Design an enzyme around this catalytic site. Structure first.
Site, mmCIF file in Angstrom:
data_model
loop_
_atom_site.group_PDB
_atom_site.id
_atom_site.type_symbol
_atom_site.label_atom_id
_atom_site.label_comp_id
_atom_site.label_asym_id
_atom_site.label_seq_id
_atom_site.Cartn_x
_atom_site.Cartn_y
_atom_site.Cartn_z
ATOM 1 N N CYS A 3 104.307 74.890 10.145
ATOM 2 C CA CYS A 3 104.971 74.773 11.450
ATOM 3 C C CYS A 3 104.551 73.602 12.280
ATOM 4 O O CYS A 3 103.210 73.375 12.216
ATOM 5 C CB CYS A 3 105.001 76.175 12.089
ATOM 6 S SG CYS A 3 105.463 77.445 11.178
ATOM 7 N N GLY A 41 101.622 77.492 7.774
ATOM 8 C CA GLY A 41 100.821 76.204 8.010
ATOM 9 C C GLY A 41 101.498 75.126 8.448
ATOM 10 O O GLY A 41 100.808 74.049 8.915
ATOM 11 N N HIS A 74 104.798 79.264 19.094
ATOM 12 C CA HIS A 74 104.041 80.508 18.321
ATOM 13 C C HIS A 74 102.987 80.335 18.033
ATOM 14 O O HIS A 74 102.111 81.532 17.558
ATOM 15 C CB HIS A 74 105.160 80.932 17.298
ATOM 16 C CG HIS A 74 105.219 80.149 16.016
ATOM 17 N ND1 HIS A 74 106.003 79.251 15.500
ATOM 18 C CD2 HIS A 74 104.125 80.027 15.139
ATOM 19 C CE1 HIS A 74 105.722 78.648 14.392
ATOM 20 N NE2 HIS A 74 104.637 79.420 14.236
HETATM 21 C C1 LIG Z 1 105.626 81.462 6.305
HETATM 22 C C2 LIG Z 1 106.575 80.120 6.650
HETATM 23 C C3 LIG Z 1 106.854 79.305 5.588
HETATM 24 C C4 LIG Z 1 107.633 78.179 5.840
HETATM 25 N N1 LIG Z 1 108.046 77.866 6.936
HETATM 26 C C5 LIG Z 1 107.246 78.732 8.126
HETATM 27 C C6 LIG Z 1 106.664 79.805 7.895
HETATM 28 N N2 LIG Z 1 106.184 80.473 8.771
HETATM 29 C C7 LIG Z 1 106.938 81.149 9.846
HETATM 30 O O1 LIG Z 1 108.109 81.657 9.462
HETATM 31 C C8 LIG Z 1 106.149 81.903 11.042
HETATM 32 C C9 LIG Z 1 107.284 82.556 12.024
HETATM 33 C C10 LIG Z 1 107.541 83.849 11.772
HETATM 34 C C11 LIG Z 1 108.474 84.300 12.808
HETATM 35 C C12 LIG Z 1 109.130 83.369 13.657
HETATM 36 C C13 LIG Z 1 108.623 82.110 13.852
HETATM 37 F F1 LIG Z 1 109.256 81.347 14.767
HETATM 38 C C14 LIG Z 1 107.746 81.809 13.014
#
Ligand SMILES: Cc1ccncc1NC(=O)Cc1cccc(F)c1
Ligand SMILES: Cc1ccncc1NC(=O)Cc1cccc(F)c1
Lengths: 304, 304
Positions: B145, B143, B41
């Site tokens: 990920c 951030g 992503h």
């Molecule tokens: C905002 C955040 C906070 C903690 N851990 C991760 C995140 N970010 C996400 O989830 C972004 C996302 C959205 C939809 C699909 C995807 F695979 C990834």
């Protein structure tokens, strides 16, 4: 989202761990620049630990008696000196992996990460609070002495603890990196009283703010209190008295959430007087005091 | 003495973290040998996340669009490929800090350490259990990920998790290092159900053995139970059914303490039916399920 008992990344500290052996005792040392720091009791046998005269014991030792091994390579010891309860072994080689560092003496109630080591090898890392009574509730077995506690600010490791001893109660005692014990402890095989401990009030309040930030809000109430009223409750429940200095450092969390410090104190007062009623806060069924206001801000903003 | 939620030393993993940027999205990558692994992503904008066609999105990208920075040095990308939900960016330089490693897909109920990272920089390390429903209760913000989960056996890092997503409930979802999600999750901005979770019974039993080893024994009773009887209680309290495979892996702890597994099951049964009555076990007021029998043996013996 989420809130964990997070330790600092231990990488910069792993690069400093060495094994120190003297006679038949082996423990961990910390190699920074051209000096190896370790608990002075490495020079003792079990019989010496009963009532050691460290000055006399160290006099029977020469540089060649201290065997320092960094992984699989041997360090040459060119000097030795005792500073308080630590030995400083001057080596002929500066540790190439020495990070930017400082030696700090932390205050009770402050937190730090411990890199538990055995035979100079890292086994694990965990986050600790230095108790108000200057003990730490660590996880240490025989051979872990010399393992260190630390904090990291960007590229600088501030070493604050070196593990020395396990009290008969199973709690832990150690020194700053100048070898000064935290608390009343002496490095001797004698039963030693740790002071009456208390719960670190400012940390529990910081953790309640962390809970609100992450959505655990059931404990918020329609009440407020005063520092005087809250402190009567803190006294009854063996909590540290809250001061304006503590309120001042909770300011960023109060500003972020819009919950005045004394209002959060009223939530804490109600939790002390009524318990959790079978509920949890951030996966805990008790009031957690191992996160400082700085830890909460750092974790909730993702500081690296 | 003592028992902590200990993470593996993160050093070997810190040396692998890089920042990956594509367009206006930045996240973490894992640089092992000459390949950088990251969540696919990274190629999406916020609008793409609603219903992304990753194959079409990746077709608009060339090697020069993926900016990979390891600390302060830039990596040259000579190939890109998508494998399940991960991107593999072939780089022209093998990571000199690549540890001995393996990619493993862990089972639900197993534990691992997470090195939380932002912009390719490590922020902290914590120990997690993969829930029976294939989510993790981590501590992650935007951030994070690309941050990975891992275990270490002497010199080998087994990477088991790469963080991808935060569910609307605040729990976390991710993949193995081949980009296969744990659980039913898809990398899309859509509300997604996590299964009904359960408590990891074998882990709570292992932690009860750890408590006995460290002196917390008030919960031991004069009773015993059977797998069938215990499982009726496990069903009522949303615990995983205990099997002979679970009893088999608790053998070392049963042998060390002399407490038969079914006798410890009877202590757990009584704790489930009566609660802790305001008492604690290893500093917890609830039954902890984030330590496996292997973790308990490792920590209680000081394995490095
Ligand atoms: C905002 C955040 C906070 C903690 N851990 C991760 C995140 N970010 C996400 O989830 C972004 C996302 C959205 C939809 C699909 C995807 F695979 C990834
Ligand atoms: C056995 C153990 C377990 C955990 N942490 C430490 C230890 N070891 C000790 O306390 C040894 C000792 C004895 C008396 C004085 C002293 F300074 C050191």
């Amino acid at each position: 989202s989420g809130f964990r008992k997070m330790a600092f990344p231990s990488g910069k500290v792993e690069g400093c761990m060495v094994q120190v052996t003297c006679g038949t005792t082996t423990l961990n040392g910390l190699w920074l620049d051209d000096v190896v720091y370790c608990p002075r009791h490495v020079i003792c046998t079990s019989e010496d630990m009963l009532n050691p005269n460290y000055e006399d014991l160290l006099i029977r030792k020469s540089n060649h008696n201290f065997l320092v091994q960094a992984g699989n390579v041997q360090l040459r010891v060119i000097g030795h000196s005792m500073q308080n309860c630590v030995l400083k072994l001057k080596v002929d080689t500066a540790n190439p992996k020495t990070p930017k560092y400082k030696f700090v003496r932390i205050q009770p109630g402050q937190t730090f990460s411990v890199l538990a080591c055995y035979n100079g090898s890292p086994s694990g890392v965990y986050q600790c609070a230095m108790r108000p009574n200057f003990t730490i509730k660590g996880s240490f077995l025989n051979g872990s002495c010399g393992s260190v506690g630390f904090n990291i600010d960007y590229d600088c490791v501030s070493f604050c603890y070196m593990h020395h001893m396990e009290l008969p109660t199973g709690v832990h005692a150690g020194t700053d990196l100048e070898g000064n014990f935290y608390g009343p402890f002496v490095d001797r095989q004698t039963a030693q009283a740790a002071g009456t401990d208390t719960t670190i009030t400012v940390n529990v309040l910081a953790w309640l703010y962390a809970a609100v930030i992450n959505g655990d809000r059931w404990f918020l109430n329609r009440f407020t209190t005063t520092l005087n009223d809250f402190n009567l409750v803190a006294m009854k429940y063996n909590y540290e008295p809250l001061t304006q200095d503590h309120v001042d450092i909770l300011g960023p969390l109060s500003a972020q959430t819009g919950i005045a410090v004394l209002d959060m104190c009223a939530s804490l007062k109600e939790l002390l007087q009524n318990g959790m009623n079978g509920r949890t806060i951030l996966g805990s069924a008790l009031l957690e005091d191992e996160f400082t206001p700085f830890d909460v801000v750092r974790q909730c903003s993702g500081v690296t």
